[model samples]
Target: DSFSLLSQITPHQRCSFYAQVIKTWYSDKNFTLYVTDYTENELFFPMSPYTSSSRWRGPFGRFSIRCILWDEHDFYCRNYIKEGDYVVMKNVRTKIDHLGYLECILHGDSAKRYNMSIEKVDSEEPELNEIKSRKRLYV
Candidate 1:
């Protein structure tokens, strides 16, 4: 798979690489969930975790994804659940009413509490395996 995935996302980082797979977001009571997956290999370029080329400098008040795209692959493959594979984007979308940071830790249907302090956008890495929240979903 070759596409820009996650590149050094942190407390003050914003990554922006084109994608041609799945893009979605849904929220329950305690946590908002987002899932953007890629087809088995639907990337134009390899997703780089080291390149800062298309990465955005944040401390950004808020941002938006205008729109998302995906082929008719029926979400067959997944990058949404593929962490460490790079492409795990964190603040790809933003709301107009709030100015807060986004950390993707809300597990698949597991609304656990995430470290509030680490919620900042430039925390080197995001930690969700050990956290808290008000949402729960099927595993």
Candidate 2:
């Protein structure tokens, strides 16, 4: 399948894309990653504007997307992923969360079956330039 832009994704679609990891946090049963391809989607969770001293690391507002990873995906992300890293995510399942916002989920079994993965990419890759360009608009 062709790579899909984060802004172009809709609920119930499984797709792949490149994104930069903006933030990460852990929950009792899963690992959460905030990522962005620098494209805005109205259905995404709204981020509050940053203050003078406490700058937000990623794109503000609806440009970022929350991805919930489970099982092995959680294990891998928690162990190796970090903020500001560029990654290629495959077979991401998009859905509308309970709050009516868009979110992406990746479960271990489906991930393995579909050869899904989250692998870091180098900054030299040309695809990253698109993200960088869009980021400049907001920065």
Q: lDDT tens digits, residues 1-139, model 2?
A: 7898898888888889999998888878999999999898989988877551254587667888889999988887887888889999988888988999999898778426777778889989998999888888868
- What total of clashing residue pairs does each candidate reach? 17, 0
- Candidate 2 lDDT: 0.86
Relative to the true structure, how large is the alpha-carbon lDDT of every model?
0.25, 0.86
lDDT measured at residue 118 in model 2 versus the true structure, 0 to 100 = 82
Per-candidate alpha-carbon RMSD to the true structure:
17.5, 2.2
Off by over 4 Å in 1: 1-4, 19-33, 36-139
Q: What TM-scores do the predictions have?
A: 0.19, 0.90
